[PDB]
Amino acid sequence: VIPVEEENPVFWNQKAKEALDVAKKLQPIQTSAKNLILFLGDGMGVPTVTATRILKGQLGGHLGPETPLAMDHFPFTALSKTYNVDRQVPDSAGTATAYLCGVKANYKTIGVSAAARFNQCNSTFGNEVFSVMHRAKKAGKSVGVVTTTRVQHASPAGTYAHTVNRDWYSDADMPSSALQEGCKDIATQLISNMDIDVILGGGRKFMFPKGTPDPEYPGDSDQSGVRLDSRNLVEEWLAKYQGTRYVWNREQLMQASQDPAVTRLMGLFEPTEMKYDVNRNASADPSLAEMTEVAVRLLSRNPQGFYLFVEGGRIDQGHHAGTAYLALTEAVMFDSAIEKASQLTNEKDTLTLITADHSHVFAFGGYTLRGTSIFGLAPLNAQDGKSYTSILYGNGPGYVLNSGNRPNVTDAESGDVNYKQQAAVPLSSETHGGEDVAIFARGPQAHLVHGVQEQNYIAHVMAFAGCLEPYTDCGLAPPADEHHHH
Amino acid sequence: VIPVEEENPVFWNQKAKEALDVAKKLQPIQTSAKNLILFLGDGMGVPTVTATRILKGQLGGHLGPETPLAMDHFPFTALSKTYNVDRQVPDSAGTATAYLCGVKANYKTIGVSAAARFNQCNSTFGNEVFSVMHRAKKAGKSVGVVTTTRVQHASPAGTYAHTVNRDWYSDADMPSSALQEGCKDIATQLISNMDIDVILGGGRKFMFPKGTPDPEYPGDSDQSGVRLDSRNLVEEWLAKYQGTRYVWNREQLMQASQDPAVTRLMGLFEPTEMKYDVNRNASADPSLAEMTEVAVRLLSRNPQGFYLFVEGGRIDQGHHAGTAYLALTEAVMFDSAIEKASQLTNEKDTLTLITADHSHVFAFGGYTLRGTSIFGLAPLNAQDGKSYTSILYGNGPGYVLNSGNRPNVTDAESGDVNYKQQAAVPLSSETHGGEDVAIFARGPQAHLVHGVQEQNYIAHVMAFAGCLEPYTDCGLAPPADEHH
Numbered sequence: 001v002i003p004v005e006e007e008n009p010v011f012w013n014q015k016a017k018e019a020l021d022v023a024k025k026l027q028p029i030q031t032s033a034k035n036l037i038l039f040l041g042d043g044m045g046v047p048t049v050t051a052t053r054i055l056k057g058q059l060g061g062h063l064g065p066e067t068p069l070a071m072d073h074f075p076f077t078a079l080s081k082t083y084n085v086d087r088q089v090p091d092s093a094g095t096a097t098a099y100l101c102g103v104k105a106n107y108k109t110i111g112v113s114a115a116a117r118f119n120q121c122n123s124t125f126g127n128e129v130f131s132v133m134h135r136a137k138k139a140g141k142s143v144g145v146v147t148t149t150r151v152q153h154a155s156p157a158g159t160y161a162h163t164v165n166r167d168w169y170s171d172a173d174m175p176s177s178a179l180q181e182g183c184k185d186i187a188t189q190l191i192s193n194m195d196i197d198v199i200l201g202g203g204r205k206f207m208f209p210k211g212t213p214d215p216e217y218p219g220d221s222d223q224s225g226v227r228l229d230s231r232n233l234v235e236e237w238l239a240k241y242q243g244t245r246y247v248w249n250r251e252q253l254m255q256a257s258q259d260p261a262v263t264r265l266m267g268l269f270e271p272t273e274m275k276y277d278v279n280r281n282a283s284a285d286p287s288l289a290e291m292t293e294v295a296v297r298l299l300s301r302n303p304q305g306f307y308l309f310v311e312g313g314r315i316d317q318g319h320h321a322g323t324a325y326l327a328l329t330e331a332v333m334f335d336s337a338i339e340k341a342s343q344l345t346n347e348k349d350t351l352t353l354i355t356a357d358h359s360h361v362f363a364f365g366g367y368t369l370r371g372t373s374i375f376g377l378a379p380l381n382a383q384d385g386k387s388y389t390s391i392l393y394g395n396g397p398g399y400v401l402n403s404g405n406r407p408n409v410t411d412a413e414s415g416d417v418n419y420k421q422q423a424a425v426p427l428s429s430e431t432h433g434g435e436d437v438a439i440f441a442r443g444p445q446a447h448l449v450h451g452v453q454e455q456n457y458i459a460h461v462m463a464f465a466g467c468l469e470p471y472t473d474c475g476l477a478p479p480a481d482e483h484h485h486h
Numbered sequence: 487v488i489p490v491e492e493e494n495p496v497f498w499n500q501k502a503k504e505a506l507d508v509a510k511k512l513q514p515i516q517t518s519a520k521n522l523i524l525f526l527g528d529g530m531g532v533p534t535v536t537a538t539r540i541l542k543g544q545l546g547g548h549l550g551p552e553t554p555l556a557m558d559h560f561p562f563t564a565l566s567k568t569y570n571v572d573r574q575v576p577d578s579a580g581t582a583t584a585y586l587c588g589v590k591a592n593y594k595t596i597g598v599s600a601a602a603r604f605n606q607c608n609s610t611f612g613n614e615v616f617s618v619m620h621r622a623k624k625a626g627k628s629v630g631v632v633t634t635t636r637v638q639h640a641s642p643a644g645t646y647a648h649t650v651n652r653d654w655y656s657d658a659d660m661p662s663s664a665l666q667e668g669c670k671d672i673a674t675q676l677i678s679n680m681d682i683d684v685i686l687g688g689g690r691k692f693m694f695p696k697g698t699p700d701p702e703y704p705g706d707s708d709q710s711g712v713r714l715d716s717r718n719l720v721e722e723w724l725a726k727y728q729g730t731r732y733v734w735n736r737e738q739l740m741q742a743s744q745d746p747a748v749t750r751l752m753g754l755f756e757p758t759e760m761k762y763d764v765n766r767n768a769s770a771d772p773s774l775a776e777m778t779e780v781a782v783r784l785l786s787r788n789p790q791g792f793y794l795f796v797e798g799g800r801i802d803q804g805h806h807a808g809t810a811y812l813a814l815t816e817a818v819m820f821d822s823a824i825e826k827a828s829q830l831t832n833e834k835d836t837l838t839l840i841t842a843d844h845s846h847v848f849a850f851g852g853y854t855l856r857g858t859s860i861f862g863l864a865p866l867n868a869q870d871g872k873s874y875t876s877i878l879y880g881n882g883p884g885y886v887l888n889s890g891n892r893p894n895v896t897d898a899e900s901g902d903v904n905y906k907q908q909a910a911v912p913l914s915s916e917t918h919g920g921e922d923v924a925i926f927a928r929g930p931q932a933h934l935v936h937g938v939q940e941q942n943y944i945a946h947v948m949a950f951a952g953c954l955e956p957y958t959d960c961g962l963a964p965p966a967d968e969h970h
């Protein structure tokens with residue numbers, strides 16, 4: 001599609017002139033930040049960002065690539081180098097330590113330096129590193145963790161846990177030697193390492209004794225509590241302070257959000273991961289944007305400020321399943337959660353960063369026409385005379401081999417919710433990509449997010465901006481009425 | 487490999503503290519720019535940048551991903567939205583119009599608005615758009631075009647040409663109707679549309695009459711001149727001004743660079759594209775960094791300043807051939823050309839941008855170990871019990887069906903110069919990717935390169951910084967002694 005207005009050079013010259021006016025008037029905010037917000041698109045590399053822009057644009061009735069995402073409005077951009085100390089193509093755990101603790105680490109370990117060794121419980125002790133969230137709490141700020149995966153997953157675990165094995169969700173996942181050597185399962189670390197004001201996401205089963213029926217799936221033994229120590233970790237967390245509340249559904253969450261007696265909130269919406277947004281039960285399950293709204297409303301009450309971590313954790317899982325429809329629809333919802341927080345916070349006192357922990361081997365090509373579906377076919381058949389989708393994965397479960405016969409997929413099949421795009425190599429799960437990811441920033445000290453940075457830099461910018469340890473001697477003025485003129 | 491120094495959190499905390507010190511001390515340069523430099527990595531998307539960082543790092547004796555590229559030192563970063571008006575997965579021609587002219591355009595057309603139509607000669611007239619290079623020349627600056635492809639290719643052509651078909655290199659490539667309707671081949675537009683001080687790259691054959699033996703390959707008919715109008719476009723370009731010089735090899739280039747009688751230089755080093763750097767004859771063929779040095783030295787002589795376009799054009803071609811070794815080695819040389827220009831220019835008076843026109847369907851994964859070759863294998867076998875390379879392409883000539891028998895490639899085979907990584911879909915040539923690309927900037931007005939921008943913004947920033955049309959009323963102070 002050739003939009004007529006774009007045929008005129010005046011359209012492009014005017015757009016560029018307006019962008020130059022925005023750039024020339026752009027001002028940095030030179031105060032500290034009262035609030036610190038980190039939005040993490042799990043697996044949301046640069047290809048995912050563009051494909052999400054096209055999808056969100058088209059859902060809104062536009063052609064796609066021209067339509068800005070909520071993240072595209074952020075004034076400051078940088079590239080983030082994602083490598084783990086031991087692996088150049090990283091995982092979620094090792095990356096979590098970098099952007100949440102400010103120290104690069106080893107693949108599959110959380111909140112520990114690279115002196116630690118994967119699955120070696122004894123290597124934990126003396127090697128723990130502390131999160132910006134932990135440090136925000138020590139400074140008197142309120143702290144929050146919001147995710148679409150289990151709250152015990154690698155990314156949210158990076159804000160509170162210290163483990164040499166990211167698979168240790170409950171005591172049921174641990175070898176006896178690790179339990180005896182003094183290692184704690186992630187679910188236990190969640191309630192005991194530090195005070196967390198807001199915990200929202202999935203992961204009910206790892207918090208309850210073995211056989212405890214799930215409130216949503218009581219008849220399914222696979223959804224039941226799994227704990228071997230018979231501890232009710234939800235009960236133990238509630239008992240820590242006055243004003244705590246536990247919710248497991250959307251109605252309870254909405255009621256809790258309005259309740260003045262509630263000051264701390266734990267909301268666990270599924271036995272493990274939350275349903276993909278497209279499969280969400282709108283009456284039972286809250287959306288990521290709803291969870292972020294409740295989190296901001298509760299955390300906002302503390303006049304000292306807050307640190308908030310929001311994770312679009314299922315973008316990663318959609319890509320692992322080679323199902324681009326799931327990965328991209330999750331990213332659409334992630335972008336809406338960014339928009340909601342923007343409506344509820346001011347850049348004058350809030351530093352908001354948007355980034356990814358790593359990328360995937362996801363790409364879209366085939367010289368597709370303007371305004372066509374991202375899930376569509378390339379305009380020409382491939383060398384074998386059969387069609388090909390714009391989206392293709394390097395590896396994963398989408399690999400097809402009907403003997404030596406490549407399928408000849410239709411537009412109807414390719415746009416299907418459960419369609420797995422073709423891949424070059426078979427794997428039960430598609431792999432991460434090792435390439436750099438974007439960092440978007442808005443608010444006090446956002447101008448420090450520039451150039452090409454090591455991933456661990458994200459944690460240091462946020463700690464510096466909030467005058468948190470090791471930067472208590474920040475030398476920054478408190479937030480006032482300095483804005484971007486954006 | 488776990489490097490011992492990286493086990494200590496103090497290493498990471500010190501590195502971040504140093505980066506914060508650089509960021510806090512970073513000062514925008516609020517003057518105009520005397521010199522405007524654009525480095526274009528053709529097809530160099532974000533995956534190519536990282537893979538090139540690892541490769542360049544390892545070639546230098548390091549582990550790889552920790553080692554900065556010359557481009558990684560640029561203070562200002564942004565994302566560029568590459569879509570063509572008619573195609574969301576773009577080509578080199580349509581993108582060239584955006585970052586060189588400041589107007590987005592249609593797929594396969596150069597220096598024309600999207601009112602024009604591909605391969606419709608009549609749609610050219612009244613729809614031409616003018617480059618920042620053309621506008622730099624009008625303002626009295628010296629102008630230069632440096633590329634590793636033929637100088638008549640889509641990207642360099644964007645600085646001087648207006649065509650509805652990027653395949654019109656010479657008159658031999660044109661239909662008779664287009665010639666009769668008044669359309670000009672790219673090679674002719676090169677010498678006639680504007681005055682270009684420095685032209686460096688390939689493309690000898692499109693400049694000479696049919697059958698003119700190539701100076702390097704006289705015995706090969708496939709390397710001979712291709713022109714049907716019997717014009718010698720090199721001779722016509724030399725005759726335009728006093729002090730012009732034509733070179734076709736490295737020794738002649740070096741001699742021309744030092745000759746005070748030479749003020750304009752045309753250097754065409756191959757019949758078509760220049761050899762891939764790994765295949766380069768070091769005595770006969772100049773490197774991209776050498777061409778960049780000669781261009782900067784010659785263009786620097788003008789007290790009014792210069793506009794210079796430098797293109798790592800074979801990065802794209804390596805990826806099209808599904809041969810990552812070629813694509814990445816070209817990008818290594820591209821990064822070295824960035825470094826050379828940095829040594830020869832001052833950020834106080836020079837605005838240098840680095841970007842890509844578009845990306846590819848190239849990626850690298852497989853949870854590879856730190857310090858391993860980018861051309862290596864993933865540490866574990868795939869689901870079918872056979873190995874897999876870290877690098878994989880979505881499509882292209884690397885596809886291997888083999889009656890459903892996926893190869894079980896070795897490290898020796900995968901690291902080979904001509905190895906084509908596996909692909910999901912067969913194509914004679916691998917396709918571009920539609921995702922955003924990076925923009926890196928240094929110098930006066932580099933701080934305007936921020937956030938997420940439309941690709942055509944690159945041309946406007948450069949025109950504004952140089953006080954070129956339509957921004958002659960820039961209101962900027964002249965370059966001074968303020969650095970980043």
Ligand SMILES: *[C@@H]1O[C@H](CO)[C@@H](O[C@@H]2O[C@H](CO)[C@@H](O[C@@H]3O[C@H](CO[C@@H]4O[C@H](CO)[C@@H](O)[C@H](O)[C@H]4NC(C)=O)[C@@H](O)[C@H](O)[C@H]3NC(C)=O)[C@H](O)[C@H]2NC(C)=O)[C@H](O)[C@H]1NC(C)=O
Pocket residue numbers: 281283284
């Ligand atoms: C999204 O979340 C929804 C909210 O929880 C969830 O809805 C629940 O779904 C099931 C239907 O699959 C309901 O249980 C079945 O539905 C009937 C319940 O009505 C009942 O009427 C009887 C009248 O005397 C009485 O015996 C019964 O106790 C009363 N229940 C209630 C809750 O007031 C019943 O006819 C049916 O047999 C029962 N049994 C089966 C399948 O054997 C349940 O009520 C729903 N809860 C709510 C609040 O609506 C929904 O399924 C979930 N998923 C989707 C896709 O929407």
Ligand SMILES: *[C@@H]1O[C@H](CO[C@@H]2O[C@H](CO)[C@@H](O)[C@H](O)[C@H]2NC(C)=O)[C@@H](O[C@@H]2O[C@H](CO)[C@@H](O)[C@H](O)[C@H]2NC(C)=O)[C@H](O)[C@H]1NC(C)=O
Pocket residue numbers: 701702735767768769770771
């Ligand atoms: C790489 O090229 C070297 C230089 O090539 C010579 O110079 C020009 C430059 O393009 C070219 O036109 C000629 O084909 C070539 N010919 C001649 C007669 O010099 C080649 O090296 C040699 O150059 C030396 C002087 O530097 C000369 O004495 C040699 O005779 C010439 N080699 C010959 C004639 O065989 C060199 O061969 C080449 N290397 C490879 C591997 O191709």
Ligand SMILES: *[C@@H]1O[C@H](CO)[C@@H](O)[C@H](O)[C@H]1NC(C)=O
Pocket residue numbers: 384385386387408
């Ligand atoms: C695949 O089906 C398409 C119809 O969309 C057809 O045009 C094409 O010829 C087919 N390719 C084959 C059967 O090789």
Ligand SMILES: *[C@@H]1O[C@H](CO)[C@@H](O)[C@H](O)[C@H]1NC(C)=O
Pocket residue numbers: 867870871872873894
């Ligand atoms: C491929 O060769 C490797 C040797 O590295 C071997 O381990 C593997 O079993 C082979 N795969 C098959 C299926 O032949």
Ligand SMILES: [Mg+2]
Pocket residue numbers: 042092149153154155156313316
């Ligand atoms: Mg995660």
Ligand SMILES: [Mg+2]
Pocket residue numbers: 216248249269270284285
């Ligand atoms: Mg639920």
Ligand SMILES: [Mg+2]
Pocket residue numbers: 342343344345346347
């Ligand atoms: Mg606001």
Ligand SMILES: [Mg+2]
Pocket residue numbers: 528578635639640641642799802
């Ligand atoms: Mg090109």
Ligand SMILES: [Mg+2]
Pocket residue numbers: 702734735755756770771
């Ligand atoms: Mg040569």
Ligand SMILES: [Mg+2]
Pocket residue numbers: 828829830831832833
């Ligand atoms: Mg310099």
Ligand SMILES: [Zn+2]
Pocket residue numbers: 042043091092316357358
């Ligand atoms: Zn991840």
Ligand SMILES: [Zn+2]
Pocket residue numbers: 043092316317320432
């Ligand atoms: Zn993952």
Ligand SMILES: [Zn+2]
Pocket residue numbers: 528529577578802843844
């Ligand atoms: Zn290109």
Ligand SMILES: [Zn+2]
Pocket residue numbers: 529578802803806918
């Ligand atoms: Zn190309």
